Design a protein around this nucleic acid. Sequence first.
RNA 1: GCCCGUCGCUAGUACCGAUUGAAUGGCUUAGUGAGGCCUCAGGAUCUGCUUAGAGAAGGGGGCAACUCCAUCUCAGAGCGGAGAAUUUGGACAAACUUGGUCAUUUAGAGGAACUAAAAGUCGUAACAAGGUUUCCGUAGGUGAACCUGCGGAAGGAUCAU
RNA 2: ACCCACUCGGCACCUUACGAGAAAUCAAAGUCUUUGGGUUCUGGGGGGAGUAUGGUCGCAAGGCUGAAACUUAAAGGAAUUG
RNA 3: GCGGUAAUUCCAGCUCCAAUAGCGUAUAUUAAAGUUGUUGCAGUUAAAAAGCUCGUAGUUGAACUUUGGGCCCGGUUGGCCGGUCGGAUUUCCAACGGGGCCUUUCCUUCUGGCUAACCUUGAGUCCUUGUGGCUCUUGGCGAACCAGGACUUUUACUUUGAAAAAAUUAGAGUGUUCAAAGCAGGCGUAUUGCUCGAAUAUAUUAGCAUGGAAUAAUAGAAUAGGACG
RNA 4: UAUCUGGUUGAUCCUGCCAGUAGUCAUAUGCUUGUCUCAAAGAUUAAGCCAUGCAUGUCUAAGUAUAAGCAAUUUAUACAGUGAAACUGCGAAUGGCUCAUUAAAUCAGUUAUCGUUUAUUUGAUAGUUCCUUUACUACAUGGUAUAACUGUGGUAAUUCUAGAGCUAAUACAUGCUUAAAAUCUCGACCCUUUGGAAGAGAUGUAUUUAUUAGAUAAAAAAUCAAUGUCUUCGGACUCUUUGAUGAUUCAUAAUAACUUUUCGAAUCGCAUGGCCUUGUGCUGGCGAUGGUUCAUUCAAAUUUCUGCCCUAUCAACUUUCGAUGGUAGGAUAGUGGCCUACCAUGGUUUCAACGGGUAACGGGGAAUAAGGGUUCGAUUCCGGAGAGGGAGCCUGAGAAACGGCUACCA
RNA 5: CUCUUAAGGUAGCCAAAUGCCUCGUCAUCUAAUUAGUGACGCGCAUGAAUGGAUUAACGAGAUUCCCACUGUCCCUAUCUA
Lengths: 124, 260, 155, 188
Amino acid sequence: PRAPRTYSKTYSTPKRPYESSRLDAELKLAGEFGLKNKKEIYRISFQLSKIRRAARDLLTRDEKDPKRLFEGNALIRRLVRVGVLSEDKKKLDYVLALKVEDFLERRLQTQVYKLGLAKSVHHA
Amino acid sequence: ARGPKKHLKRLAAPHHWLLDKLSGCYAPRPSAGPHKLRESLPLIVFLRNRLKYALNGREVKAILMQRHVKVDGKVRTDTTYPAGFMDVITLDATNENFRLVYDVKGRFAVHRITDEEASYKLGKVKKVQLGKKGVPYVVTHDGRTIRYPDPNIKVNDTVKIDLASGKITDFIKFDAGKLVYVTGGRNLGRIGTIVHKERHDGGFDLVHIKDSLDNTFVTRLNNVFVIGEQGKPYISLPKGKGIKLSIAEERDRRRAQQGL
Amino acid sequence: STELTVQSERAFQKQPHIFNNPKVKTSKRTKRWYKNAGLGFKTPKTAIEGSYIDKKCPFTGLVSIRGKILTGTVVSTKMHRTIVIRRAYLHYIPKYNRYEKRHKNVPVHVSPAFRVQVGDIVTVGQCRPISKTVRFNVVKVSAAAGKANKQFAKF
Amino acid sequence: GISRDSRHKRSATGAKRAQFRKKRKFELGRQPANTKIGAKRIHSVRTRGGNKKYRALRIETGNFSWASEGISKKTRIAGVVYHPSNNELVRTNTLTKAAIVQIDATPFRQWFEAHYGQTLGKKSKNAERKWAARAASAKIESSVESQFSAGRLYACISSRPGQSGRCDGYILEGEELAFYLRRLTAKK
RNA sequence: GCCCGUCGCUAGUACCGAUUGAAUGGCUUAGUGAGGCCUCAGGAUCUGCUUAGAGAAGGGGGCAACUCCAUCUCAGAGCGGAGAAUUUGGACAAACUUGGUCAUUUAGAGGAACUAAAAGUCGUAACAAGGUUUCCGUAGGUGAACCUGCGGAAGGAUCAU
RNA sequence: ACCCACUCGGCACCUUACGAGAAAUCAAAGUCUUUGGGUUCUGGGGGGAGUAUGGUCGCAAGGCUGAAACUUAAAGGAAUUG
RNA sequence: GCGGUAAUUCCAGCUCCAAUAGCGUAUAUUAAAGUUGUUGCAGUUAAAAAGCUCGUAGUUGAACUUUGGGCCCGGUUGGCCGGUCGGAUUUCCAACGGGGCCUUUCCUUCUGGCUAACCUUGAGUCCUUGUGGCUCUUGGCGAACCAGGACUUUUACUUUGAAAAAAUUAGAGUGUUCAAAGCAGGCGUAUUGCUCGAAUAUAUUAGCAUGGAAUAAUAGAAUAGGACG
RNA sequence: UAUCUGGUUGAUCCUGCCAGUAGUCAUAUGCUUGUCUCAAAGAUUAAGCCAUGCAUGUCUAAGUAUAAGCAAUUUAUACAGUGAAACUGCGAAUGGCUCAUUAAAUCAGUUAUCGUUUAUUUGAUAGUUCCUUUACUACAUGGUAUAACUGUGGUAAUUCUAGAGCUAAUACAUGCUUAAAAUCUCGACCCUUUGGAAGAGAUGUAUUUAUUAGAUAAAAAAUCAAUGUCUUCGGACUCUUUGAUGAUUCAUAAUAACUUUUCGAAUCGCAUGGCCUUGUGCUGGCGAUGGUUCAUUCAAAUUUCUGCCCUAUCAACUUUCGAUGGUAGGAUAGUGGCCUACCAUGGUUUCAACGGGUAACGGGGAAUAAGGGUUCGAUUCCGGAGAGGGAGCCUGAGAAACGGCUACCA
RNA sequence: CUCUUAAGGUAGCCAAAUGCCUCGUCAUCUAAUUAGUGACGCGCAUGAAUGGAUUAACGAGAUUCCCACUGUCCCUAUCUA
Ligand SMILES: [Mg+2]
Ligand SMILES: [Mg+2]
Ligand SMILES: [Mg+2]
Ligand SMILES: [Mg+2]
Ligand SMILES: [Mg+2]
Ligand SMILES: [Mg+2]
Ligand SMILES: [Mg+2]
Ligand SMILES: [Mg+2]
Ligand SMILES: [Mg+2]
Ligand SMILES: [Mg+2]
Ligand SMILES: [Mg+2]
Ligand SMILES: [Mg+2]
Ligand SMILES: [Mg+2]
Ligand SMILES: [Mg+2]
Ligand SMILES: [Mg+2]
Ligand SMILES: [Mg+2]
Ligand SMILES: [Mg+2]
Ligand SMILES: [Mg+2]
Ligand SMILES: [Mg+2]
Ligand SMILES: [Mg+2]
Ligand SMILES: [Mg+2]
Ligand SMILES: [Mg+2]
Ligand SMILES: [Mg+2]
Ligand SMILES: [Mg+2]
Ligand SMILES: [Mg+2]
Ligand SMILES: [Mg+2]
Ligand SMILES: [Mg+2]
Ligand SMILES: [Mg+2]
Ligand SMILES: [Mg+2]
Ligand SMILES: [Mg+2]
Ligand SMILES: [Mg+2]
Ligand SMILES: [Mg+2]
Ligand SMILES: [Mg+2]
Ligand SMILES: [Mg+2]
Ligand SMILES: [Mg+2]
Ligand SMILES: [Mg+2]
Ligand SMILES: [Mg+2]
Ligand SMILES: [Mg+2]
Ligand SMILES: [Mg+2]
Ligand SMILES: [Mg+2]
Ligand SMILES: [Mg+2]
Ligand SMILES: [Mg+2]
Ligand SMILES: [Mg+2]
Ligand SMILES: [Mg+2]
Ligand SMILES: [Mg+2]
Ligand SMILES: [Mg+2]
Ligand SMILES: [Mg+2]
Ligand SMILES: [Mg+2]
Ligand SMILES: [Mg+2]
Ligand SMILES: [Mg+2]
Ligand SMILES: [Mg+2]
Ligand SMILES: [Mg+2]
Ligand SMILES: [Mg+2]
Ligand SMILES: [Mg+2]
Ligand SMILES: [Mg+2]
Ligand SMILES: [Mg+2]
Ligand SMILES: [Mg+2]
Ligand SMILES: [Mg+2]
Ligand SMILES: [Mg+2]
Ligand SMILES: [Mg+2]
Ligand SMILES: [Mg+2]
């Protein structure tokens, strides 16, 4: 008799488990941005896939629809506020086109390295 | 279930109390009272969650037993006394007067009123009959039964009451074009000057509304509370005057205030 | 039903509390009582004219009509002062996005004010529990005879 | 004990219905008063909500009202002579509602002969005015007057004695008295 | 080359089956029937109201006559209440005995399938016109595949006088 | 009676393939991922097995309705080369 | 499918891969499965059309009954302009919708209450050479619904809306140090308060309320026992 | 977030299943295990069985204190502080747990009570109680009979209790009371008319029965039986009052009676003051517990419409010993075949009744991500059911209660 | 394969009222069964109108078990004519 403490999972897992091309491109990200898991890449692709999903569902509506405008601008403005979405391409047909490295780019892992201060993604 | 239930669980409490999910297991169960369970606000919720005048519920019991808080004139020592629409919450200390009146989103508001306005209340007559000894009476939405009222006073009218003596001072009838507070439904807390009433003999008269922004909506006649004239209420309305801006409108307002 | 000699029971039939003083020589011979059911349902003249004594009548009796008003076609008139109607309706199966014919039979009291026969569409109104199964009362007939007068002999 | 539920009792389809929920107190029944005549004895029963019901058993006098005459008297109850529900109530002289009983008729005689001054069957100053301002309204009835000789009048029970502890009713008159008369003699 | 059946060994599963076989669960006849409740009775004792006496008190107010309200104390008598054990008749009705029914299981001599199964023994049924073209239905017969009668099909070994 | 032209409705055959099919082939087996005219019936890997059991029909023989446990990685179709 | 003496499958050493505070296995279920097929299967020969025909229940079922033309009112986007110190409305223009009219045209219906709109007009006119414009009472709009009487062929579908618990889901705001969460919090004179919140959506069958009148049913006037007054 | 791959062949294209693959608010188990936050957890099988401890008790200025209890200060020689025991009052019908039964049941949405009970909270609500109505009824307040306690006891044994002796109330059981006025019945008389009268009783609320009022669809008249107000004595009666609902025999009121007569304060706490004819007269402040009726609130019980998994190797089912309906009654808080009596022959079904199964509590929901679906929900909220199995019942507003009783079975 | 016949016992059926061995073996019924029944069958010596197998109904027919019932018994007693 307590309100159930809600939870959720932050990662997804690829279906084909041994796709060698996919494994290659994953290590590159882990090696570039200094990750330790494939889950650290799985998480971002999971977050990115839901973001696209809202965008997909919104585009099928009619332009300047109440829900589409309200929730669409929020999604655009949020991605902008953290620095993942470019200032010019700011109308959600590009958030559909967003890729993984854009999210990886904003981690305190990378800004700490990009702005000197570590001279190495792993020193970061 | 062999008997009346005497415990209210959280997540089962009415949502318009705005009680957090965790931090406990139960909500205050409103006592038997003038207002229904699911449309009241117990004194503990008001003195602790609304006003922040107490941290624990144990302090609410300490404040109340000292006659500090008074309801509609009388003292009301009950911890979970069910207080509801149109009531008056007075503090002798703090010199503060409140009246329970709804938000625009469907919640009771912290509405501060004058010292003298807090001396009278409104009440919707829910039924009028001929009582024993030939004495006709009216009964208001908060249990009050007033004997010997005006004959023209019919059901669904509203009534201004003395709160100091029990009697009625003035009434308002239920005609087209009268200020209405919507109490119930997803239009709870709107205020819109009656347009038209759908009759429907057998059940659930509809009542069309039109606020001061040329917007229209309908609610069941039971959820309509007449509160005066076009632009001329009979109680001080809360800020925003129940106009229900859109989500896009409210986002603009809250973000139109952006400079420190 | 009730057909011919209303006084056909062990107990004397009478309307409750509708007193007729014998000392006062009257011409109507029985002070009779009736009410208007409501909702614009005409209280038929046969209920006012006739001299039946049904206490479950919605026009002369001590029941009230409130709640659901339903219609349906008459499918059995074999019970005394009560019938059974078949209300039909199509029920929607979403998975197939189509419908199926379903039906329910409703047992309903019928005042001898009305003269019903199988086939007639009838309007019924919900009242208190009348019997073990009857929860509706016949209140208006929408058919007449289902083209019975147009089924005569040779021309 | 007795249960008034419909949870037993095959459905309209005739189907057998399984037992769900042991018997409750609020669906209860109780036993009949089977109230007989004479030597008053009433027992109060404590009913739901604390309200009492007064179960009569052996009542002897009730309050019976002459309908067309505008009065009521408390008379002895002679016996039961006709019951539409069950003949055994008559054989046992059992008092229930809608029973046809016989009553004292002497309190109804005393009132009439004083009110009209006409002495059913076969001097003061104001009393002469009263009796004269009256009848022309005392042509009571053929088959209601011809019961006073025997000293007993037919009256129907309108109270529920097992519930209230009263055995009240009204003298039989007119069409209704004709009905039970026809029954009373054709089977005698 | 492929390949069919009887027959023989090992293991497994399911079946039929004397035992009028066994077990669990749900209903239920008939008989027996606890207890509480209702009800007819009952009176261990324990008092009410009413009727009168004997011995005293208190006064509506008198010179003798006159006279009310409360309360205490014993011979004795008229018309109601409480209420124990007990007890009549009831409805409700657990449960016991003996049966029936439904559902779910279930042992068994022995009987007879199938599989594992590939192979072993006897044959050559089938696939080439498979050496008697094959197959279907039906009927009878034979260690075994199978044979034969009658009527079909070509999925034939013939789209053709 | 025969000949010629037409037109309905027959049993078929010839050539094409726009089209269809795994193919053999098919004016339906076509007008289906550009997937909807109406409607009936059956099938869902191979054995086990049309067996067991119950029901029902029958004089019989048998008919109709008709499982499972277990076993198994194939069985099968059309075509191609040998 | 490997193993019967050089084993890319076993037992190990070495090295290597995958996921990683986690990883295997068993059982179930979902996806893959258009191998249950409404969307969406297959049935000549691969598994599958009853030997044949009748036939009730069931499902299904030809076409046709106010179309076409005319006028008016006012809405929401989008243009060419910006009047103004990002956003604004007129006139010009399209474009797509809604309401109401007259064309032989029930709108259920009479009896008053009411009138919002003009066939009105009573004067003229702020003012661009005037039908651009509305305040404005004395003959003359019904439907815009009150309430009282008198009655009504039946339905399916679709529209909108009321009635509607919270947690859950989708989703807004908010930097729990992040995040899962939470419903907080954010500002100051941080020495005697200021203040934003605690949204929105789905809620689908049925029932209720309302707009629609295509599609698909139903009922009507044939022994006239018809229809209006 | 719309993907397939391995395995039939000498090769080939199919059909087709097997295998792989990923997820699981999905259980287990193996190996391994450092930090933060978060936190399910004897459901599955056995609603099988249970040692022991605990989980229901509760006091205000304000019902009852002679503890032979403590405390003494402090106005207190009836009491007065604090307070064991005990009485009284209230609560124990909530909560918590489990998912056994249960398939038109439960349950969900949607209805109904003009078909009922409702402690409580809140708001209203009570001048009537007596008696043939001057030698009068306790109202300055009527009755005992009990616990605790004191003492005498029984039993191996318990939240066992017996005999004897005391004493309380907001326990129990009784029983007074208050204005005015009107309307009704009787009627002593007097006098004859057109008649009208001194004063005797009745009349709180509740209960039971009967009668009646509670109009309204728009307007007028003659007459009968009664009998109302005002006479300018042929006569007129002019103004005459009406509540709610779609709807009632509704609310409410009136009449004649009825009742082992419901209620109408014999209660408590703080203050103690006005006002004279000085009676310790007569008055009087605040709020506590109560109390009948109505309302309100917390509820409850029934209840309309529609919607459940598999099953025909279940096709007819239902009335034995109610199945479907009618009349009357009984019983219930109330509707109703709920039960009884009488009468009738009905009620359901291929649009699947009835029966069987469920390793079935229903729902909010959960898992799986093109869509359409598939599968699951014992379990944090809602509803229901239960307390070893049945049945019965006491108390009470509320229980067919089980941390209540009684009986049978285990 | 071999001897040999007119032919060399087929379908059935069985320790059967037919089996010596025999109180056959297995199961069942019982505390215990030369009994009963169901099975098995190289059956001394079953077997087809010398008719074989099956069989509802019927039987003062032979046999076995069960229920009810009982002085048959334990274990005897008593009365009448
Ligand atoms: Mg509370
Ligand atoms: Mg009948
Ligand atoms: Mg046996
Ligand atoms: Mg009885
Ligand atoms: Mg087999
Ligand atoms: Mg084989
Ligand atoms: Mg060969
Ligand atoms: Mg061969
Ligand atoms: Mg051959
Ligand atoms: Mg070709
Ligand atoms: Mg070696
Ligand atoms: Mg080697
Ligand atoms: Mg090696
Ligand atoms: Mg994994
Ligand atoms: Mg579709
Ligand atoms: Mg397929
Ligand atoms: Mg073939
Ligand atoms: Mg085939
Ligand atoms: Mg064919
Ligand atoms: Mg057929
Ligand atoms: Mg058509
Ligand atoms: Mg909707
Ligand atoms: Mg292979
Ligand atoms: Mg190969
Ligand atoms: Mg080769
Ligand atoms: Mg698989
Ligand atoms: Mg659990
Ligand atoms: Mg368990
Ligand atoms: Mg087990
Ligand atoms: Mg205690
Ligand atoms: Mg003391
Ligand atoms: Mg509970
Ligand atoms: Mg006593
Ligand atoms: Mg009225
Ligand atoms: Mg004083
Ligand atoms: Mg059939
Ligand atoms: Mg009946
Ligand atoms: Mg019958
Ligand atoms: Mg079916
Ligand atoms: Mg279960
Ligand atoms: Mg389920
Ligand atoms: Mg599937
Ligand atoms: Mg559940
Ligand atoms: Mg379970
Ligand atoms: Mg219970
Ligand atoms: Mg247990
Ligand atoms: Mg119990
Ligand atoms: Mg317990
Ligand atoms: Mg309990
Ligand atoms: Mg032979
Ligand atoms: Mg043989
Ligand atoms: Mg033998
Ligand atoms: Mg023998
Ligand atoms: Mg023997
Ligand atoms: Mg033997
Ligand atoms: Mg034998
Ligand atoms: Mg031998
Ligand atoms: Mg022989
Ligand atoms: Mg025999
Ligand atoms: Mg014979
Ligand atoms: Mg024998």
